[PDB]
Amino acid sequence: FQSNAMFAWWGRTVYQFRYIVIGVMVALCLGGGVYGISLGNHVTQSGFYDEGSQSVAASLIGDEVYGRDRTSHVVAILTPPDDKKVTDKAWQKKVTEELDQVVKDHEDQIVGWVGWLKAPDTTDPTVSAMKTQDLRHTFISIPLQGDDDDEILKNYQVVEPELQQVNGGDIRLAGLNPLASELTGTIGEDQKRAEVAAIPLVAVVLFFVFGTVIAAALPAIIGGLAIAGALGIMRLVAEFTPVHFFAQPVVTLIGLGIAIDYGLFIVSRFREEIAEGYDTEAAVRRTVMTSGRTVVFSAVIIVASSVPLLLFPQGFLKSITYAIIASVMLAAILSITVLAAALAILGPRVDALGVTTLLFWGRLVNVVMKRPIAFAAPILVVMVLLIIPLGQLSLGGISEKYLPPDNAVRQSQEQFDKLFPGFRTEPLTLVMKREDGEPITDAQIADMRAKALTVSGFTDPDNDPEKMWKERPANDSGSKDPSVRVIQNGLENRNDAAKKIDELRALQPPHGIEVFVGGTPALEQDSIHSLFDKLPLMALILIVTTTVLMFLAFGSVVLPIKAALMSALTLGSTMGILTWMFVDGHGSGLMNYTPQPLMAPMIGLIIAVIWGLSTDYEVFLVSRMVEARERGMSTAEAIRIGTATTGRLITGAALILAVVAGAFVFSDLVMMKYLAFGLLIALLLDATIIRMFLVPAVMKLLGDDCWWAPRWMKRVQEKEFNIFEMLRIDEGLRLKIYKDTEGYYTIGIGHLLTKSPSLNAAKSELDKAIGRNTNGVITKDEAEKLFNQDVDAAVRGILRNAKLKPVYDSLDAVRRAALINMVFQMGETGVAGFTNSLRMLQQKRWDEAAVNLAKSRWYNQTPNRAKRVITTFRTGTWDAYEFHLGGIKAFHHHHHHHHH
Numbered sequence: 001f002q003s004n005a006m007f008a009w010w011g012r013t014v015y016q017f018r019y020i021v022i023g024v025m026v027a028l029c030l031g032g033g034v035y036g037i038s039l040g041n042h043v044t045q046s047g048f049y050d051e052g053s054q055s056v057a058a059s060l061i062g063d064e065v066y067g068r069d070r071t072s073h074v075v076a077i078l079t080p081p082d083d084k085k086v087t088d089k090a091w092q093k094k095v096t097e098e099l100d101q102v103v104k105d106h107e108d109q110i111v112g113w114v115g116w117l118k119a120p121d122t123t124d125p126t127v128s129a130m131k132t133q134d135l136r137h138t139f140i141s142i143p144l145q146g147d148d149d150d151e152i153l154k155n156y157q158v159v160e161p162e163l164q165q166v167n168g169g170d171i172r173l174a175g176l177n178p179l180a181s182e183l184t185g186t187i188g189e190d191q192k193r194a195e196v197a198a199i200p201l202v203a204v205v206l207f208f209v210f211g212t213v214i215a216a217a218l219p220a221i222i223g224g225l226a227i228a229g230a231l232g233i234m235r236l237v238a239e240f241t242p243v244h245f246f247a248q249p250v251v252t253l254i255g256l257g258i259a260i261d262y263g264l265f266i267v268s269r270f271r272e273e274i275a276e277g278y279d280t281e282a283a284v285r286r287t288v289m290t291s292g293r294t295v296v297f298s299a300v301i302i303v304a305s306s307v308p309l310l311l312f313p314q315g316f317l318k319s320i321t322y323a324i325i326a327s328v329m330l331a332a333i334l335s336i337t338v339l340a341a342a343l344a345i346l347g348p349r350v351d352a353l354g355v356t357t358l359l360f361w362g363r364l365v366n367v368v369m370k371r372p373i374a375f376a377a378p379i380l381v382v383m384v385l386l387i388i389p390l391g392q393l394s395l396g397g398i399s400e401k402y403l404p405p406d407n408a409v410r411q412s413q414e415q416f417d418k419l420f421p422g423f424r425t426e427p428l429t430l431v432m433k434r435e436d437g438e439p440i441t442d443a444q445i446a447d448m449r450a451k452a453l454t455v456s457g458f459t460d461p462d463n464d465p466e467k468m469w470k471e472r473p474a475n476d477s478g479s480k481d482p483s484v485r486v487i488q489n490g491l492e493n494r495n496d497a498a499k500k501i502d503e504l505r506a507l508q509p510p511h512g513i514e515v516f517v518g519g520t521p522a523l524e525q526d527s528i529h530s531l532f533d534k535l536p537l538m539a540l541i542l543i544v545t546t547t548v549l550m551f552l553a554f555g556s557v558v559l560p561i562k563a564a565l566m567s568a569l570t571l572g573s574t575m576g577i578l579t580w581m582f583v584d585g586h587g588s589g590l591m592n593y594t595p596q597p598l599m600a601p602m603i604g605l606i607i608a609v610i611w612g613l614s615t616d617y618e619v620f621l622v623s624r625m626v627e628a629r630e631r632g633m634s635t636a637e638a639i640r641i642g643t644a645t646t647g648r649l650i651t652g653a654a655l656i657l658a659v660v661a662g663a664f665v666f667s668d669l670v671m672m673k674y675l676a677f678g679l680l681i682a683l684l685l686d687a688t689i690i691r692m693f694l695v696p697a698v699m700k701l702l703g704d705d706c707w708w709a710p711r712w713m714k715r716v717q718e719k720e721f722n723i724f725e726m727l728r729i730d731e732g733l734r735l736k737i738y739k740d741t742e743g744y745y746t747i748g749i750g751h752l753l754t755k756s757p758s759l760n761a762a763k764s765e766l767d768k769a770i771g772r773n774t775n776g777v778i779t780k781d782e783a784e785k786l787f788n789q790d791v792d793a794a795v796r797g798i799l800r801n802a803k804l805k806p807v808y809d810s811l812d813a814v815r816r817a818a819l820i821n822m823v824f825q826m827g828e829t830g831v832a833g834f835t836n837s838l839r840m841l842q843q844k845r846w847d848e849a850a851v852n853l854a855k856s857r858w859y860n861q862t863p864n865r866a867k868r869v870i871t872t873f874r875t876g877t878w879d880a881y882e883f884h885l886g887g888i889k890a891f892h893h894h895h896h897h898h899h900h
């Protein structure tokens, strides 16, 4: 159930108010860009866990009571120069002084530095392990101030430039915060690689789509305004909800491409409307009423494919979904507001600037429709084989391996673990809270320790069961509430985590004690089960909402059911190739990334993104095919006509987003590589294999049941504009007798009753004409009957005139109505006066014919009606009447008033 009255209204109103539209929208988005370049200072790295999970509650209680663990913030490997040993007291004094100096200057950022180097004469075996036994390396630990991840990372980045100079610059920093800042700086590095390699390439792809500077430049400006405004929207959202770092490149990697593609399509159809003969006002309105609603539907489909991600509790996916929605909706709005008004101002000047300014699909579709199974099956089988790698698949958490294997910080983390094994631990934790409020007695701790010892698989370094599950270290920021106690122990093999936790949760607590299972493996496993638990509902919502929207678009039941599984196939094979690439490792040597399990939220994100991409492209294409079959075309020529006029623009937009995605696949953060490669793969599969070979065959074998419209769930076609409506516009419709501009009694559509002055004689002739006694008033249908009679009289007169019959037989029905209109107005001799223009019309030289007709006295005397009729001759459509300014005030009776 459409409403193009709104799109018609907006296509008119955006032309009317084009200046304030461009002003307001450009102002708002550029202001948003100023507002949102500060977005990078208000994003978070938190959002990978399930903050409603038991392990998160365990972590919160632990950090409250015992104090958050700051021992892993920054580890620094110092090694003396000149192959000196770490017991050199001069080098010891120098480096101790340097470190106390850097701590003295940044006490609001650094808590202090720990390590053997502070007390080199000590008994502590753990502290004495902070030096290698060859005594040429020793590490310190530098805890930082801060009570959330973002604040601690900001403090680390504040003190890092001076910390890095300690010991002649030969100090290697690792730990949570060096790794975190490297991982988060990959974002800015990707944005600049985009800025430098993508925008020239997409600019020249734009210029190859339109061989014109201005037409190519408009979608690029739309994309830039989209990026600016979306960063502004995201900075505004950041003041209510946390927004993840990853939301920033998603604005560029997905937002910019789609905004540019929207601009592509709208400028393309504006140019083609101008080429079809319409003026820039009608051109703007039709561009809106067609491509603007295609892009609005495109935005609705992308939002419908991204929203299910909100089912997941990870703030990561939440903020990414918000970024996608803002980018896409702002892109659509801009493309039918700033871009529409810009085109309304420019007009045909969009093509004024050529390249000189410097300072076939139908053969392909038809080859493959008489040979369908020669491509169908030998493509579906290859795609299911491309999915068989998907069964190979694992998931994991963030690691230093997410950086390239030659990354300095990753390498020093790996050398820290190499030189000092056993410090880096990820214990599971039993956190116990007494419901009531009293301290927890040692009997309860011993009980819980025994019940922890019934379960196998926990590390026992000293081979004494009594001394595993030691109490968590308690520091100066813990409340030390005696009603809460934490014990902890690492796993021998972390692959057992998922089950070990599940059995430690299966333990029954002591009487009056609540126990939460926490620790890094618990957080990761709880988040993985979060995603896996709420993934099926995600997929179902995704699928069925996409297919009901394709019900709305195609007006079919078999075509959406086909496109749904075709897109399921695209998604499956894309993910299979992605797993062959990033888990099995094929491509890891050339691209410089480590083969490893995938981030779990990336699964939901990639499902949503690739699914939305494929159904967006399939709707955009087969849309024109359903319109072809609706425009009398056959199925076959329908598939052909659909692929034909779309091909160039589809491949252009595909190439632009492929360029920016290929800019992003070089990122140092492997999650970025995975997502951008999934984009490239799904793109190249959707733009050629499925688009060219799969859909036309599959829709040929579905012969004519490709459109099955059951019940009243299909678009009936509405009132076709006719000559009655045209001249009701041009001559009015009056149901009561009146006097025209000559004082003659007229009724209906310009129907002269009599030249007599007696209104009663006019009433007599109208009573005779209508068949009843009317007292001077008729109904609408009787007026239509009188008009049909007059039209028949005018056509008979035309076919009787040697000067008019040839051109009249020449013309189509709409242009025939234009000629009958001219005859009605001025007589057949008057119309036959236009010898040259009538010949031009006869020769279908619509352009020159319109030009010559506008040079006439007819145009000068009645420019609005003459202009409408001339436009009808040019375009051969009813556009100049279907949408026009209100009404007319001077009523004059026409020639061929028919009497009987």
Ligand SMILES: CCCCCCCCCCCCOC[C@H]1O[C@H](O[C@H]2O[C@H](CO)[C@@H](O)[C@H](O)[C@H]2O)[C@H](O)[C@@H](O)[C@@H]1O
Binding pocket: 045, 049, 051, 056, 059, 060, 062, 063, 067, 068, 069, 070, 147, 148, 149, 176, 179, 180, 183, 184, 245, 246, 398
């Ligand atoms: C854009 C892509 C780049 C991705 C960058 C990812 C960098 C990875 C850095 C990992 C930092 C982990 O830090 C270790 C911390 O883990 C837990 O606490 C954390 O988990 C809780 C769940 O809510 C929060 O409440 C706490 O605030 C929060 O610190 C422990 O309780 C803390 O004792 C410990 O110190």
Ligand SMILES: CCCCCCCCCCCCOC[C@H]1O[C@H](O[C@H]2O[C@H](CO)[C@@H](O)[C@H](O)[C@H]2O)[C@H](O)[C@@H](O)[C@@H]1O
Binding pocket: 071, 072, 075, 114, 115, 124, 126, 127, 141, 174, 175, 176, 423, 424, 425
């Ligand atoms: C992915 C990131 C991986 C990063 C791995 C993290 C590396 C972990 C490094 C942590 C070093 C911990 O060691 C430092 C020592 O702190 C505590 O003692 C504190 O109070 C004592 C007073 O009696 C003083 O003597 C100590 O100097 C003082 O630190 C503990 O009681 C010791 O047991 C522990 O040895």
Ligand SMILES: CCCCCCCCCCCCOC[C@H]1O[C@H](O[C@H]2O[C@H](CO)[C@@H](O)[C@H](O)[C@H]2O)[C@H](O)[C@@H](O)[C@@H]1O
Binding pocket: 577, 581, 585, 586, 587, 588, 589, 590, 591, 680, 681, 684
């Ligand atoms: C628009 C882009 C869409 C991308 C389409 C999907 C293709 C992605 C790239 C897939 C692998 C590309 O090849 C890149 C890799 O080639 C070789 O290895 C491959 O050839 C060896 C023969 O001995 C075998 O041993 C290895 O298993 C095998 O991976 C090199 O050893 C690697 O240095 C390099 O990384």
Ligand SMILES: CCCCCCCCCCCCOC[C@H]1O[C@H](O[C@H]2O[C@H](CO)[C@@H](O)[C@H](O)[C@H]2O)[C@H](O)[C@@H](O)[C@@H]1O
Binding pocket: 001, 002, 290, 293, 294, 296, 297, 300, 552, 553, 619, 623, 624, 627
């Ligand atoms: C406070 C501010 C709130 C703003 C609210 C904004 C709501 C956004 C929804 C706007 C309604 C737009 O919906 C699109 C509507 O048009 C579709 O067809 C159109 O796309 C086809 C592609 O195939 C072309 O072929 C057709 O020419 C063309 O008519 C379908 O006919 C309708 O089923 C559908 O509903």
Ligand SMILES: CCCCCCCCCCCCOC[C@H]1O[C@H](O[C@H]2O[C@H](CO)[C@@H](O)[C@H](O)[C@H]2O)[C@H](O)[C@@H](O)[C@@H]1O
Binding pocket: 193, 197, 198, 201, 404, 406, 590, 591, 592, 658, 659, 660, 662, 663, 664, 666
């Ligand atoms: C179908 C159309 C698709 C068009 C796609 C092309 C459009 C955008 C292409 C932009 C290419 C920019 O340059 C590519 C990259 O070269 C090196 O990369 C590094 O990558 C690995 C990471 O460790 C290691 O191999 C080396 O450190 C080093 O090679 C530079 O260090 C990067 O700064 C630079 O970004």
Ligand SMILES: c1cc2c(s1)CCOC21CCN(Cc2ccc3c(c2)OCCO3)CC1
Binding pocket: 254, 257, 258, 261, 262, 264, 265, 294, 295, 298, 302, 305, 608, 609, 610, 611, 612, 613, 614, 616, 617, 620, 649, 650, 653, 657
């Ligand atoms: C109206 C629509 C279109 C026009 S005019 C021109 C060609 O491109 C489309 C727009 C882009 N779209 C592809 C696409 C790209 C990225 C996506 C995505 C979909 O969906 C989910 C997140 O990321 C295909 C159709």
Ligand SMILES: NC(=O)CN(CC(=O)O)CC(=O)O
Binding pocket: 833, 834, 835, 836, 837, 838, 852, 853, 856
């Ligand atoms: N509209 C017309 O045909 C005007 N013609 C009149 C004619 O054909 O004799 C004059 C012209 O072509 O300059």
Ligand SMILES: NC(=O)CN(CC(=O)O)CC(=O)O
Binding pocket: 730, 731, 861, 862, 863, 864, 865, 866, 887, 888, 889, 890, 891
């Ligand atoms: N706008 C008017 O009513 C006057 N005119 C219309 C015009 O100037 O084009 C008379 C007509 O319709 O033939």
